[PDB]
Design a protein around this nucleic acid. Structure first.
Lengths: 98, 82, 107, 93, 18, 95, 86, 107, 93
DNA sequence: TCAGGATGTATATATCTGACACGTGCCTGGAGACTAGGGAGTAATCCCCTTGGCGGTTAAAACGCGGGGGACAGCGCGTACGTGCGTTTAAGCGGTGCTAGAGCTGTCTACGACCAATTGAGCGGCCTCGGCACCGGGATTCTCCA
DNA sequence: TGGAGAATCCCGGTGCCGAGGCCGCTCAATTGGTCGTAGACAGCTCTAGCACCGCTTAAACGCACGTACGCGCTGTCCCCCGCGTTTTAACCGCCAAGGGGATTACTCCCTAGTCTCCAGGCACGTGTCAGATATATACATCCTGA
C-alpha cells in the first residue's frame, strides 16, 4: 500500500509553512497583467513603475489574508471548518464594504 | 493594446495559498470566484485613486508614491515604499 | 562663536533643526514655538527606540544579527500597545503572526 | 539630487539599543516611513488643537496633548516623560 | 502591572547605556 | 394572549418608526459623571454635551445590535448571544 | 463641600432600555446574558470618548466639558456627529 | 466703482468671499487661487441642493411641510451615493431605516 | 460676539428647490454641520494635493481633483460640472 | 380555506402653543483699485527606466481519480425567554436659589519671524568583507497502519 | 499500545552581494541681531450648571406559566482533498528603442498686502400658524374554532 495522508494533515502543514514564510503568493506576471487591464478602463496608454506594481501586490495580498482570517472566524462561528461565500459576504458586510 | 480575461491568472492554488496563510483548513469551490470578485473590486478602487493622483500631476507614469497615497487615502497605510 | 547642535543641548539623537524646518514648512500653524521641535524629536526618538528594541529581541530569537521586515512585524504585532498604534498599517514583507485555530487541530 | 531621510538617526538609536545588531535596507525604509507617519499624525493633531483654541502657535503644550491623544496608555506616559525631560534639559542650558 | 513594570526597565537601560 | 414573537415584531416596527432616545436621561447622566470622575475630579458638563454623548452611544449600540443580528442569523438562530457580539466587535476591529 | 462619589450607575442602563435598543436594531429574541455584555461594551465606548473629551477640555484650561469637545472626540475616533455645532 | 458680489458673478447662492476667507485663514496652503473659492462654493451649493431636494421629497411623503432630522436621515440613507459619502456620520434625532429581516417574519 | 453660519444660504437653496417647504432649527444645524464637514474634507484634500506636488497655491485644479477623489460617481460628475460652469461664468465676466 | 372576537393602528377633527418666518439698525467684513515680487508656466535637453521581444528551463498549474469526512436535514427533549399582571420606585417637571466659571476687555512684554554671514553635519559615490542564502547529508520527529 | 516511512530540524562547507565604512563636497543648520504682535495676566460681568423640594405617573421590577427555540444526536451522500501525470507559461537572462521624468533657465502675470468705501448679514423683537396632543373611530391583524 502506498503512503497517503488523511485529509487535513497536508492542510495543516501548508498552514504552518505559509504562515512561517513571508514571500508573495501570487505570480508576478498575471498580477501585472491584471493591474494593466484594470487601469486600461480609466486612462489609456498608462505606464507603471515596477515598485508601483509591487506595492499593489503587497497591499492586495495583505487585504486578502485579513479577509480570509475574518472568513475563517465566521465559518468557525457557524460551526463549520469549510469556508463558504456567505462567510465572505458576512465579513465584508460587518466590515462595512457592502 | 487591449488585455482581456486576466482575472483567471489568479489561479485556484494561489487563492488557496492565500487562504492557507489566513489559517483556513477547508475551502469550498465557489470561494475562488468570490475571491476574484472582491479582488477586482479592491483593485479597481485603489487603481482609480492612483490614476487620479497621477493625472493631477500631469504624468503618464503611475509611480509607487501614487499607490501609497491612494492606500493612505483609503485608510490602508503601507510601509516600505517611500 | 563655535556652534553646538540643538540635539546636543537636549541630549537627543534625532535632529531638532530638521524637525523644526518640517514643522515650519508643513503649514501646520502660523508660528512654531521653540520647545515644540525638541518635544517632537524626543517623542520620535522614544518610539524608534521602542520598536528597534523589540525588533532586535525578535531578531536575536531567530539567531540573526540583521533586522529584516519580518522581525519588525513580529515586534509590532506581539506587543499590545504598538499593535494598537499600528492597527491600520501594512508592513511590506511582514508576514502573519503564526496562530492556528483550536478547532482545526486534530483530536 | 539630495533626498533627506532618517537613516543615520535610526542607525544611531539602534547602536544605542542593540550595539552589535545591523538592519536591512528594507527595514530601514520601513522605519523611515514609520517616523514620517508618526510625525504627520502628531503634527496634524497639534494643528487641530491650535486651531480649536483660536491660537496661532504650536508650542510644547500642543505637542504634549497630541501625544496624549494619539498614543495609548503606557506609551503615552513614557513619551510625555521623555519629551518633558528633553525640554527641561534643553531650557536648562 | 506585569507588562507596565517591564517598560520602565526598557527606558532605564537606555539611560544606563548613556 | 398573543403568541411569542408578535409583540416583538410590533415593538420592532414601533421603535424603528420613531426617533426619540431610548435610555433614560438621569441614569445616563449619572453614568457619564461616574466615568468622568476617573480622569479629573470636579468636572462640569454642559447639557448639550451629555445629550451628544447619549445620541452617539445610542447610535453605536443600535449599529452593534444590527451587526449582532446578522451574526446570529448566520448561525441559523433567532436569539442573539454574547458570542455574536464578540464576533461582530472582533470583525469590526474593536477586540 | 459634599464630595459625592458615585458608584454602580451602570445598572441604571436597565434591561428594558437594552431591549428597546435591540428592538430598534431589529432583534427578535434576546438572551439573558446579553445585558451584562452590553453594559460592558457601553462602558468601554463611553470611557474611550470621555477620556478624549476630558483631554480636549484640560488642554483649553477649562473646568466644564463643552459639546464641541465631545464632537471633536467623536471626530477623532471617526464617528462624526451632526447637529451639535462645528 | 459700483460693487457686485462674487456670488452674483457666478450665479451662486453660497458666499464666495466667505469661502475665500476661510481658505486663507484655515492654513491649507501659502497662497489661494482666485477660482478655487468659486469652484468650492459651487460644489457646496450643489451638494446642499442635492440633499435638500431628497429631504423635501421625504417630508412631502409624510405629509409634513417642515424638514425634521428624520427626513434628512431618510434622504441620506435611501440614496446610495449620499449614504456612501456619509457612511461614518451619525445624524442626531435621525432614527434608523425600517428594515426587518425576512427570516424573522412568519410565513 | 456674533457667530456665523450657513443658515440663510441653506434657506435660499431650499427656497430654490422646494418653494413651499420650511425647515426646523435642528435640521438647519445639521445642514450647517454638513456644509462645514464637506468644506473641511475638500479643503484638506486640496491642501494635501498641493503639498504632494510641491506647489504653494490651491487652484481650481486642486479643488476639482479633491472633488473627484471624495465624491462617488454621479455626485462627482455633476459636482465637477457645476464647479466648471460656475468658474466659467465667473471668469467670463 | 372561512370567520368572529378582540386589540392595536392610522385616520377625521378641535385648539393652543411656541417655534418659525420676517422686519429693523448697524457694523464688520466683503469689494474695488493699485503696487510689487516670486511662483508657476514654458521651452530645451538628457538620459534613465519602461516596454517589447526571444530563447531555454523547470517548477507550477491543470486534469483526472478514488475515498473518506464534513455539511446538512431530520428528530426529540428540555431549558429559558416572551407575555401578562400587579406592586414598587424613581424619572420627569416645575420652580427657586446661588455661585463657579466662561467670556470679554485692556495693558504690556517676552518670544518667534526675518535676514545676513558662516561652516560643519549630512549625503552621494566607491570599495569590502562577512552574514546570510544554498545545498549535501544525517538525526530527530510526526503520522499512519497494526 | 509498536514499526515504516515521509518530513523537518540541525551541521557544515561555499559563494556572493549587500551592509558598513570612508571620503570629498555642498547647503542647510547655527548664531547674532532688530521688531512687532501674539499671548499672558488682571479684572469685571452675568450666564448656566449644580443642588434642592414636592408631586405625579409612567416605567421598572418581580413572579408565574407555557411554548418555542437551542442543541445534541444520527444518518446520508457528495464534494473536497490527496496524489499521480502531463501540459504550459512564469521566470530569468539578454538586447534594443525610445518616451517621458527630471532638470535648468527665463519671464510674466497672478496673488498677497494696504487703503478706502459701503451694504449684507446678524442680534433683536414680534406676529401667527404647523403640528402636538387629545378625542372619536372604522379597519387591518392575529388568535381560536370550524
Amino acid at each position: 500500500k502506498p503512503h497517503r495522508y488523511r485529509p487535513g494533515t497536508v492542510a495543516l502543514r501548508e498552514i504552518r509553512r505559509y504562515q512561517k514564510s513571508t514571500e508573495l503568493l501570487i505570480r508576478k506576471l498575471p498580477f501585472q497583467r491584471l493591474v494593466r487591464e484594470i487601469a486600461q478602463d480609466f486612462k489609456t496608454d498608462l505606464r507603471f513603475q515596477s515598485s508601483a506594481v509591487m506595492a499593489l501586490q503587497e497591499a492586495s495580498e495583505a487585504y486578502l489574508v485579513g479577509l480570509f482570517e475574518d472568513t475563517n472566524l465566521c465559518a468557525i462561528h457557524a460551526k463549520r471548518v469549510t469556508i463558504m461565500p456567505k462567510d465572505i459576504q458576512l465579513a465584508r458586510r460587518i466590515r462595512g464594504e457592502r | 493594446k487591449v488585455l482581456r480575461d486576466n482575472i483567471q491568472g489568479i489561479t485556484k492554488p494561489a487563492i488557496r495559498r492565500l487562504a492557507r496563510r489566513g489559517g483556513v483548513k477547508r475551502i469550498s469551490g465557489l470561494i475562488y470566484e468570490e475571491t476574484r470578485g472582491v479582488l477586482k473590486v479592491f483593485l479597481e478602487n485603489v487603481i482609480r485613486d492612483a490614476v487620479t493622483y497621477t493625472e493631477h500631476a500631469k504624468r503618464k507614469t503611475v509611480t509607487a508614491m501614487d499607490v501609497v497615497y491612494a492606500l493612505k487615502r483609503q485608510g490602508r497605510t503601507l510601509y516600505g515604499f517611500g | 562663536a563655535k556652534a553646538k547642535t540643538r540635539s546636543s543641548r537636549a541630549g537627543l539623537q534625532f535632529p531638532v533643526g530638521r524637525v523644526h524646518r518640517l514643522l515650519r514648512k508643513g503649514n501646520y500653524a502660523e508660528r512654531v514655538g521653540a520647545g515644540a521641535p525638541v518635544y517632537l524629536a524626543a517623542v520620535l526618538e522614544y518610539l524608534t527606540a521602542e520598536i528597534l528594541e523589540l525588533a532586535g529581541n525578535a531578531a536575536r530569537d531567530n539567531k540573526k544579527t540583521r533586522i529584516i521586515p519580518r522581525h519588525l512585524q513580529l515586534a509590532v504585532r506581539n506587543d499590545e500597545e504598538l499593535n494598537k498604534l499600528l492597527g491600520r498599517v501594512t508592513i511590506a514583507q511582514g508576514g502573519v503572526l503564526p496562530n492556528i485555530q483550536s478547532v482545526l487541530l486534530p483530536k | 539630487t539630495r533626498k533627506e531621510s532618517y537613516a543615520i538617526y535610526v542607525y544611531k538609536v539602534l547602536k544605542q539599543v542593540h550595539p552589535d545588531t545591523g538592519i536591512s535596507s528594507k527595514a530601514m525604509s520601513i522605519m523611515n516611513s514609520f517616523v514620517n507617519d508618526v510625525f504627520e499624525r502628531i503634527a496634524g493633531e497639534a494643528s487641530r488643537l491650535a486651531h480649536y483654541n483660536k491660537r496661532s502657535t504650536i508650542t510644547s503644550r500642543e505637542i504634549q496633548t497630541a501625544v496624549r491623544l494619539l498614543l495609548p496608555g503606557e506609551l503615552a506616559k513614557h513619551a510625555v516623560s521623555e519629551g518633558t525631560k528633553a525640554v527641561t534639559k534643553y531650557t536648562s542650558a | 502591572l506585569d507588562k507596565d513594570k517591564d517598560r520602565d526597565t526598557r527606558r532605564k537601560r537606555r539611560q544606563g547605556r548613556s
